């Protein structure tokens, strides 16, 4: 509950057969403070591979379990995820991308992970890599929240990454399914933050999207921001 753990638990990254020791320590029966300390020690001793494997095997299933059970993330587990983001390579490749690729991401975890991302400063290279990873996978409902919050992180956006995002938006013309306006909010954020990085054919593509997929309220605002956008 409180105090310090025995220091032999902190020599686990210094070991060679750390997986057997981890299975002995039974991470499924750990408490939130113990997992927070474990993530802190794992992020304080380099070795992005073992941290990524720990997040894939331990932290993400426990987050899924207590979000599905208690309908809210734990306080110490929120700190554990914040500590895990201090090594952003392990956090993106170990928690965010596998949960996005799972296809069963809940909205609560989507909002929690997005708030964690907007709490923190993301590197421009890492943010662009995250953009390219989101834009290349299949469409899901919760992924638009991730893309919108990464977009209103408001970082510099390269050529191929922005074009991949644009063609991800262009991949929706033949879809007759009802679309959320949250996707339109991600689109509006992209237009509002990157109107100077929008070329011509992209702009008429978005106008014909708004003609094909209209919205009573936010689509006029998207039309205004496209029509009053200066290039270059």
């Amino acid at each position: 509950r409180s105090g310090k753990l025995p220091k032999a638990f902190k020599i686990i990254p210094a070991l060679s057969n750390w997986e057997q020791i981890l299975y002995v320590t039974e991470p499924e029966a750990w408490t939130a403070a113990a997992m927070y300390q474990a993530t802190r020690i794992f992020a304080s001793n380099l070795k992005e591979r073992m941290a990524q494997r720990f997040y894939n095997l331990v932290l993400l299933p426990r987050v899924r379990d207590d979000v599905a059970e208690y309908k809210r993330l734990n306080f110490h587990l929120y700190m554990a995820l914040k500590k895990a983001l201090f090594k952003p390579g392990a956090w993106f490749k170990g928690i965010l991308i596998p949960l996005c690729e799972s296809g069963t991401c809940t909205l609560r975890e989507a909002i929690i992970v997005g708030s964690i991302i907007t709490k923190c400063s993301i590197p421009v290279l890492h943010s662009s890599a995250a953009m390219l990873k989101i834009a290349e996978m299949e469409y899901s409902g919760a992924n638009s929240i991730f893309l919108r919050l990464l977009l209103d992180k408001k970082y510099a956006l390269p050529y191929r990454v922005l074009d991949a995002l644009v063609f991800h938006f262009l991949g929706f013309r033949t879809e007759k399914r009802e679309l959320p306006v949250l996707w339109h909010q991600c689109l509006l954020t992209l237009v509002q933050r990157y109107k100077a990085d929008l070329a011509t054919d992209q702009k008429e593509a978005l106008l014909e999207l708004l003609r094909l997929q209209p919205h009573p309220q936010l689509s006029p605002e998207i039309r205004r921001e496209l029509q009053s956008a200066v290039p270059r």
Partner: peptide, 24 residues
């Protein structure tokens, strides 16, 4: 990969995107 770009007005960093998905 896309077909169009931002075309002109220079580049700053090409960005290293192959260090994330290539791990797993």
């Amino acid at each position: 990969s896309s077909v169009m770009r931002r075309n002109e007005q220079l580049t700053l960093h090409d960005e290293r995107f192959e260090k994330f998905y290539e791990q797993y």
